[PDB]
Each structure stands twice: as C-alpha cells, then as structure tokens.
Amino acid sequence: QEDSDIAFLIDGSGSIIPHDFRRMKEFVSTVMEQLKKSKTLFSLMQYSEEFRIHFTFKEFQNNPNPRSLVKPITQLLGRTHTATGIRKVVRELFNITNGARKNAFKILVVITDGEKFGDPLGYEDVIPEADREGVIRYVIGVGDAFRSEKSRQELNTIASKPPRDHVFQVNNFEALKTIQNQLREKIFAIGSPGI
C-alpha cells in the first residue's frame, strides 16, 4: 500500500508487424489491469526514431482506465532508439509536471523487439541517470533477436540488477501473456522481498 508510478516504454519500430503490435497493446492493457491498485498510476511512451507520450501519470489519474488509454494507439514505425527512449522516460514521464509523485516507487517496463540502432545515445549515457533517479527497470525482449545468450546482454544492460529478476525473454508476441503472472509477482515484491 505504497505509491507506485509505473511507466511502460514500448518499441514501435517497423520491425514489429501490425498484428504483433496489437498483441503488445493487449499485453500492456492486461498487465496494467492486473497491477492496478488504489495508489498506483501508469504512464506510457512509445518509441522508435520518434517518441510519443500516449498518456502521462496525470492523465491516467484523471482517467484510470488502461484499456481505453492503450487500445487506440497507433504504431510509429521506423528504427529503434532504445537509449533515447529510456532518457525520455526518466526526464519526461517521471517529472512532476506530468503527474509523477515525489517519493513514489519509480518502475519502468521496457518492451523491445530488437537491438538498439541509429540511436545517438548509448546505454552508458542513460543508465547511470536512471539509476540515480531510482528507476527500477524491467525489460522484455521479444523474438529471435534475443534468443541467444550473447544477444540478451543488451537486455541485461537495460534492466536493473540482478538481471535474473528484471529480464524476461519470450520467443514471440503471442507468448507475452505467458509472463504476465511472473512480471506481476516481481513488481509486487518491490519493497516487500519474499512477502
């Protein structure tokens, strides 16, 4: 029963086909409904080689209905600037001007379908700031892009430590639903280890 500001950063690159993008929206909608608590607020940013704040924590507070907010979003297409996406989440979504609560838990769930590409920023330019700001990061790597162990190193770089408790890997978008319970349990364990 502690305030939690949970942000989602979703990859909208052209590497994701339309049907899969819709599967991702369903996943986000469902997870938000399952994480829904009286003192929890959600915010969502989509990213590619453009960035779009679909809803701020303030907007969610005024209309706390995940599905209604997520369902209508359209895919940006383009490349994959994951690092800049993380910077914008930290500076924009978790900003008081957008409804973030001072002293609340700061949680970020990143959903990516591929390796960072075309980004002027490297993870070394954005992760330290995210850590200093206290943003707990979870990452979901979808598809063959992260089938390998070596490829998952990027996921480990994005997620908070230890990776074993913050990194999720699914073979495709249809399998996203298979980690919904696991993701909820981990986020619910924040500030309450072992419960």
How many CB atoms are located within 10 Å of the residue 36 CB?
Answer: 13
Question: In a 10 Å sphere around its CB, with 0-12 CB exposed, 13-18 middle and 19+ buried, how is residue 131 labelled?
Answer: middle
Q: Are 7 and 105 in contact (CB under 8 A)?
A: no
DSSP H or E stretch at residue 45: strand 40-47
Q: Are 53 and 93 in contact (CB under 8 A)?
A: yes
Three-state SS at 193: coil
Q: How was this entry determined? A: X-ray
What is the dihedral sign for C-alpha 109, 189, 105, 37?
Answer: positive
Domain boundaries 1-195, corresponding CATH code: 3.40.50.410
Cβ contacts of 19 within 8 Å, gap of 6 or more: 173
Locus of tokens 């929206």 = 25
Residue 51 to residue 177: CA distance in whole angstroms: 25
Q: Which amino acid is at 47?
A: Y
Q: Are 75 and 18 in contact (CB under 8 A)?
A: yes
Three-state SS at 179: helix
Cα–Cα–Cα angle for 9, 23, 73, rounded to 5 degrees: 55
Residue 179 to residue 166: CA distance in whole angstroms: 12
How many CB atoms are located within 10 Å of the residue 178 CB?
Answer: 11
| β-strand partners of 40 | 4
Residue 4 to residue 182: CA distance in whole angstroms: 18
Q: Are 119 and 81 in contact (CB under 8 A)?
A: yes
Residue 186 to residue 195: CA distance in whole angstroms: 11
Domain chopping of the chain, boundaries: 1-195
The structure was resolved to a resolution in Å of: 1.5
* Bond prior to 162 in cis (omega within 30° of 0): yes
How many CB atoms are located within 10 Å of the residue 192 CB?
Answer: 8
Give 86-144 as a 3 state SS string.
Answer: HHHHHHHHCCHHHCCCCCCEEEEEEEECCCCECCCCCHHHHHHHHHHCCEEEEEEEECH
Minimal CA–CA distance to 11: which of 96, 93, 105, 89?
A: 89
Q: Cα 47 vs. chain centroid, distance in angstroms?
A: 10
Residue 109 to residue 140: CA distance in whole angstroms: 8
Q: Are 12 and 76 in contact (CB under 8 A)?
A: yes
